[PDB]
Amino acid sequence: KETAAAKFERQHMDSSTSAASSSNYCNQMMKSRNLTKDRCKPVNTFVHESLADVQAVCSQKNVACKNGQTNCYQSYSTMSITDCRETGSSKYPNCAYKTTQANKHIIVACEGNPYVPVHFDASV
Ligand SMILES: O=c1ccn([C@@H]2O[C@H](CO)[C@@H](OP(=O)(O)O)[C@@H]2O)c(=O)[nH]1
Numbered sequence: 044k045e046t047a048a049a050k051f052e053r054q055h056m057d058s059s060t061s062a063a064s065s066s067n068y069c070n071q072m073m074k075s076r077n078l079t080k081d082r083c084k085p086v087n088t089f090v091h092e093s094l095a096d097v098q099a100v101c102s103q104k105n106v107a108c109k110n111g112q113t114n115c116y117q118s119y120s121t122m123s124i125t126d127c128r129e130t131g132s133s134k135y136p137n138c139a140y141k142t143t144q145a146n147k148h149i150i151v152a153c154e155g156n157p158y159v160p161v162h163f164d165a166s167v
Pocket of ligand 1: 054086087088126161162163164165166
């Protein structure tokens with residue numbers, strides 16, 4: 044198994060590096076986190092901040108989620124993140140990604156007790 048919260052950490056947390064250096068970050072990280080084993084996950088964002096900092100977003104700016112649900116939250120401060128987007132030549136199982144580093148406000152969906160992140164919605 045795997046809790047929804049655990050999956051969020053596996054799919055979106057990377058407190059080890061301050062920023063994605065070198066264009067090969069995503070190719071390695073996406074495979075490393077098992078995001079390309081069943082297929083190539085199209086888009087995925089990694090957050091380069093402490094777990095406490097990201098978890099704290101669940102008590103920050105309440106905003107509507109893209110699917111219409113009301114349990115999304117936007118970080119007050121910008122955060123260091125890395126977007127991974129699959130390229131065109133990308134063909135399973137050899138998934139290929141474009142690595143994009145940036146500093147933006149993240150938006151995550153939270154749920155449960157404790158109230159923690161379970162989905163990365165967007166960055167703005
Ligand atoms: O900026 C973006 C946009 C999308 N996704 C990712 O694409 C996913 C698939 O619907 C979702 O993963 P998740 O729901 O397991 O977090 C997330 O919205 C990101 O990780 N970052």
